[PDB]
Write an enzyme that holds these catalytic residues in place. Structure first.
Site, PDB file in Angstrom:
ATOM      1  CG  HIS B  41      -2.897  -9.971  -6.558  1.00 43.01           C
ATOM      2  ND1 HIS B  41      -4.254  -9.401  -6.923  1.00 43.01           N
ATOM      3  CD2 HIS B  41      -1.907  -8.937  -6.463  1.00 43.01           C
ATOM      4  CE1 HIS B  41      -3.891  -8.078  -7.194  1.00 43.01           C
ATOM      5  NE2 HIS B  41      -2.563  -8.107  -7.256  1.00 43.01           N
ATOM      6  N   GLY B 143      -8.905  -2.249  -8.343  1.00 42.27           N
ATOM      7  CA  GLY B 143      -9.045  -2.547  -9.888  1.00 42.27           C
ATOM      8  C   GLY B 143      -7.941  -2.423 -10.939  1.00 42.27           C
ATOM      9  CB  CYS B 145      -4.193  -5.290  -9.697  1.00 47.29           C
ATOM     10  SG  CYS B 145      -4.203  -4.616  -7.761  1.00 47.29           S
TER      11      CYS B 145
HETATM   12  C1  LIG Z   1      -5.714  -4.889  -7.188  1.00 43.16           C
HETATM   13  C2  LIG Z   1      -7.128  -5.664  -7.919  1.00 43.16           C
HETATM   14  O1  LIG Z   1      -7.559  -6.226  -6.728  1.00 43.16           O
HETATM   15  C3  LIG Z   1      -6.151  -3.795  -6.422  1.00 43.16           C
HETATM   16  O2  LIG Z   1      -6.943  -2.775  -6.706  1.00 43.16           O
HETATM   17  N1  LIG Z   1      -5.820  -3.887  -5.007  1.00 43.16           N
HETATM   18  C4  LIG Z   1      -5.288  -5.034  -4.209  1.00 43.16           C
HETATM   19  C5  LIG Z   1      -3.819  -5.638  -4.239  1.00 43.16           C
HETATM   20  C6  LIG Z   1      -3.537  -6.694  -3.752  1.00 43.16           C
HETATM   21  C7  LIG Z   1      -4.376  -7.409  -3.040  1.00 43.16           C
HETATM   22  C8  LIG Z   1      -3.608  -8.789  -2.427  1.00 43.16           C
HETATM   23  C9  LIG Z   1      -3.798  -8.567  -0.704  1.00 43.16           C
HETATM   24  C10 LIG Z   1      -2.333  -9.005  -2.708  1.00 43.16           C
HETATM   25  C11 LIG Z   1      -4.375  -9.884  -2.686  1.00 43.16           C
HETATM   26  C12 LIG Z   1      -5.506  -7.289  -2.999  1.00 43.16           C
HETATM   27  C13 LIG Z   1      -6.204  -6.139  -3.507  1.00 43.16           C
HETATM   28  C14 LIG Z   1      -6.351  -2.919  -3.822  1.00 43.16           C
HETATM   29  C15 LIG Z   1      -5.266  -3.174  -2.817  1.00 43.16           C
HETATM   30  O3  LIG Z   1      -4.059  -3.071  -2.837  1.00 43.16           O
HETATM   31  N2  LIG Z   1      -5.918  -3.909  -1.532  1.00 43.16           N
HETATM   32  C16 LIG Z   1      -5.091  -4.260  -0.306  1.00 43.16           C
HETATM   33  C17 LIG Z   1      -4.501  -3.138   0.504  1.00 43.16           C
HETATM   34  C18 LIG Z   1      -3.643  -3.323   1.708  1.00 43.16           C
HETATM   35  C19 LIG Z   1      -3.164  -2.385   2.287  1.00 43.16           C
HETATM   36  C20 LIG Z   1      -3.457  -0.927   1.895  1.00 43.16           C
HETATM   37  C21 LIG Z   1      -4.236  -0.740   0.563  1.00 43.16           C
HETATM   38  C22 LIG Z   1      -4.810  -1.824   0.018  1.00 43.16           C
HETATM   39  C23 LIG Z   1      -5.694  -1.540  -4.518  1.00 43.16           C
HETATM   40  C24 LIG Z   1      -6.233  -0.348  -4.073  1.00 43.16           C
HETATM   41  C25 LIG Z   1      -5.515   0.819  -4.572  1.00 43.16           C
HETATM   42  C26 LIG Z   1      -4.314   0.615  -5.328  1.00 43.16           C
HETATM   43  N3  LIG Z   1      -4.007  -0.460  -5.675  1.00 43.16           N
HETATM   44  C27 LIG Z   1      -4.298  -1.568  -5.261  1.00 43.16           C
END
Ligand SMILES: *[C@H](CO)C(=O)N(c1ccc(C(C)(C)C)cc1)[C@@H](C(=O)NCc1ccccc1)c1cccnc1
Ligand SMILES: *[C@H](CO)C(=O)N(c1ccc(C(C)(C)C)cc1)[C@@H](C(=O)NCc1ccccc1)c1cccnc1
Lengths: 305, 305
Positions: B41, B143, B145
């Site tokens: 992603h 971040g 991820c």
């Molecule tokens: C990863 C870097 O962007 C990140 O930290 N993150 C995340 C993960 C996955 C995605 C998609 C939707 C698969 C593209 C976007 C962003 C956030 C995160 O998970 N945002 C979406 C979300 C949805 C539902 C509940 C919470 C967050 C992240 C934040 C904290 C911990 N891990 C990931």
């Protein structure tokens, strides 16, 4: 989201761990620049333990009686010195892996990471607090002596603890890196009282703020209190008195959550007087006091190194 | 003595963490030999999130659209492939710090250390368990991820987890290093049920043995039970059923303590039916299920790496 007891990345300290042997005894040492640091009781044998005369024992030792191994590399010992309860072995090679570092003497209530080691090899890393009575509640087996505690600030390692011994009560005692014990303890096999411990009030409050940031909020109440009133309750429950300096260091968390410090004190007061009624806070059924306010902001802000 | 939630020393993994950038998005990658592994992603933008067509999005990217930075200096991306939910970027330089490693897919109930990272830089290390419902209860901010989970055996790192996302419920989901999600999750911004979690029974028993080893024994009772009768209570309290295979892996702890497994089950049964009555076990007021039998023996035996 989430809240864990998080230790610092241990890589910069792993590269500093060596094995020190002096006759019978082997333990861990810390190799920084061209000096190896280790507990002086490396020069004891099993009959010295009740009351070693460390000056007399060290006089019988020469440089070549100290064997220092860094992985497979042998260090050549070219000088030895005792500073308080630590031995300083001068070696003829500077550690190429020496991080930027300082020696610090931490305050009770502050936290640090421990890299537990045996025979100079790291086995695990965990976070702990220096208790108000200057013990730590660690996980240390025979041979863990010389394992160190540390904090990291960007690239700089602040070494604050070297492990020396376990007390008969099962808690742990050690020194700063100048060899001065934390607390009243001495490096001999005698019963030694640690004296009354207390709960680190400012850390409990920090962790309640961490809970609110993570959505655990059932404990917030309709009350407030005063510093004097709260400190009456703190003393009844064997909590450290809260000072204005503590209130000030809680400022950033108070600002982020919108919860005045004295309002969070009133929540803590009710938790102390009424218990938790079988509920949990951040996965815990007890009030947790091993996170400083800095620990909370670092974990809730993402600071890296 | 003492028992702590102990992570593996993170040094071997720290040297593998890089920053991966694809246009707007930055996260962490894992650099092993001449390949960088990261969540696919990274190629999404903020409107892609609801249901990205990852094949179509990757086709609009070429090698030079990926910027890999290992601390100071950039790596040259010379190839790219998608494997399940991970991107594999071939770079022109083999990581000089690559440890001996394996990719493993772990079983629910197993534990590993997580090195939480942001922008390719390590921030902290902690131990956790893969829940029976294939989530982890981590500590992960935006971040994070691409942060990875791992175990170490002597000098070999077994990578088992790459962090992908936080669920709306605040728990965390990710993949193995072949990019296959643990559990039923997909990498898109939709509500996703994790489903009922259970407590890892064999781990709770292991931790009770760790307690006895460390001297905490008020919970040992005069009763015994049967595997059949214990599983009756296990199901009422949402515990995983105990099998004979679980009994067998608890053998070494049973032998070291002299307490037959079924006797420890009767103690756990009484704890489930009666609670702790304001007592604690190894400093906890809850039954802990994040230590495997192997975790207990390693921490109570001092195995190094
Ligand atoms: C990863 C870097 O962007 C990140 O930290 N993150 C995340 C993960 C996955 C995605 C998609 C939707 C698969 C593209 C976007 C962003 C956030 C995160 O998970 N945002 C979406 C979300 C949805 C539902 C509940 C919470 C967050 C992240 C934040 C904290 C911990 N891990 C990931
Ligand atoms: C350090 C390597 O020998 C070690 O592990 N260790 C220890 C520490 C200090 C000493 C003297 C008495 C200062 C020479 C000897 C041995 C043991 C330990 O502490 N033994 C003494 C002890 C233990 C418990 C209660 C009373 C006395 C040690 C074991 C576990 C954790 N840390 C240290």
């Amino acid at each position: 989201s989430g809240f864990r007891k998080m230790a610092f990345p241990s890589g910069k300290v792993e590269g500093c761990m060596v094995q020190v042997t002096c006759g019978t005894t082997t333990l861990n040492g810390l190799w920084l620049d061209d000096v190896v640091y280790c507990p002086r009781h490396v020069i004891c044998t099993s009959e010295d333990m009740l009351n070693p005369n460390y000056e007399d024992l060290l006089i019988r030792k020469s440089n070549h009686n100290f064997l220092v191994q860094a992985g497979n590399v042998q260090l050549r010992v070219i000088g030895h010195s005792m500073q308080n309860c630590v031995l300083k072995l001068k070696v003829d090679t500077a550690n190429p892996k020496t991080p930027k570092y300082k020696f610090v003497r931490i305050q009770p209530g502050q936290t640090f990471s421990v890299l537990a080691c045996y025979n100079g090899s790291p086995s695990g890393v965990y976070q702990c607090a220096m208790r108000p009575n200057f013990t730590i509640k660690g996980s240390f087996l025979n041979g863990s002596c010389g394992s160190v505690g540390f904090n990291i600030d960007y690239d700089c390692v602040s070494f604050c603890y070297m492990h020396h011994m376990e007390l008969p009560t099962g808690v742990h005692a050690g020194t700063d890196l100048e060899g001065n014990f934390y607390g009243p303890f001495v490096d001999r096999q005698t019963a030694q009282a640690a004296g009354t411990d207390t709960t680190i009030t400012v850390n409990v409050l920090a962790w309640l703020y961490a809970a609110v940031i993570n959505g655990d909020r059932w404990f917030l109440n309709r009350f407030t209190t005063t510093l004097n009133d709260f400190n009456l309750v703190a003393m009844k429950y064997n909590y450290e008195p809260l000072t204005q300096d503590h209130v000030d260091i809680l400022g950033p968390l108070s600002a982020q959550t919108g919860i005045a410090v004295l309002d969070m004190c009133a929540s803590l007061k009710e938790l102390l007087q009424n218990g938790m009624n079988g509920r949990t806070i951040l996965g815990s059924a007890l009030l947790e006091d091993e996170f400083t306010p800095f620990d909370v902001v670092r974990q809730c802000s993402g600071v890296t190194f």
